[PDB]
Amino acid sequence: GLRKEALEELMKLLNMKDFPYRIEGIDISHLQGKYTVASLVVFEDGFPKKGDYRRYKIEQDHPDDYESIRTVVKRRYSKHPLPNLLFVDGGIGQVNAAIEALKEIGKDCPVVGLAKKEETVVFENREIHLPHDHPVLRLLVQIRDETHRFAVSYHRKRREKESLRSVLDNVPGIGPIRKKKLIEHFGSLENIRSASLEEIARVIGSTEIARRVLDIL
């Protein structure tokens, strides 16, 4: 959890009138040739509120992160109330994009960023360079680490099936029909590695091939 004392120090650093009780945080990640996926996490009272997590997708072949932050802010806050504080996993450009989008829709909320490579809190067009051990720095890192975990989970299931397929592409003489059977049945390397020779054989109709699957696993 986010510590109370550090939240108070954050509030002070940002000259916030209100305690940052609800904080929403945005990661922007792009799938080339496909879309940008914005992942939105929620902290209330210092802990994740996972029921309230959301994603936003912006269909475009090439990234445009500032426009993506703008679109997310307008889409989200035209439907949802603002939080006490908005965190963006980026620097001056991302924070400014969010501020400008909020202005566009006539809304006020503090926005804070963490520069991706710099020990730098970003707030109101300025980089605040804190010492590395600073409790507010550690706090924003915890937030960033959660927006990152959530962002990575996108298409986890897809990736697991892909990872399993890649490993099965290594078993000699399996073929595409039996490969798909194994993927649809097991879903992941975790699940197939838990399976008996006999289960694997039953999925594909061959103990001989199942032994080669076990070999490759």
Swiss-Prot record:
Protein location: Cytoplasm
List the GO biological process terms.
DNA damage response; nucleotide-excision repair; SOS response
Keyword DNA repair appears in the UniProt entry: yes
Question: What GO annotations for molecular function exist for this entry?
Answer: DNA binding; excinuclease ABC activity
Q: Does the keyword Cytoplasm apply?
A: yes
Mark the transmembrane ranges.
none
- The protein's superkingdom reads Bacteria
Q: Which UniProt keywords are present, listed alphabetically?
A: Cytoplasm, DNA damage, DNA excision, DNA repair, Excision nuclease, SOS response
Provide GO CC annotations from the record: cytoplasm; excinuclease repair complex
Q: Which family does it belong to?
A: Belongs to the UvrC family.
Oligomeric form and interacting partners: Interacts with UvrB in an incision complex.
The record's function comment reads: The UvrABC repair system catalyzes the recognition and processing of DNA lesions. UvrC both incises the 5' and 3' sides of the lesion. The N-terminal half is responsible for the 3' incision and the C-terminal half is responsible for the 5' incision.
Put simply, this protein is called UvrABC system protein C
User: What's the source species for this entry?
Assistant: Thermotoga maritima (strain ATCC 43589 / DSM 3109 / JCM 10099 / NBRC 100826 / MSB8)
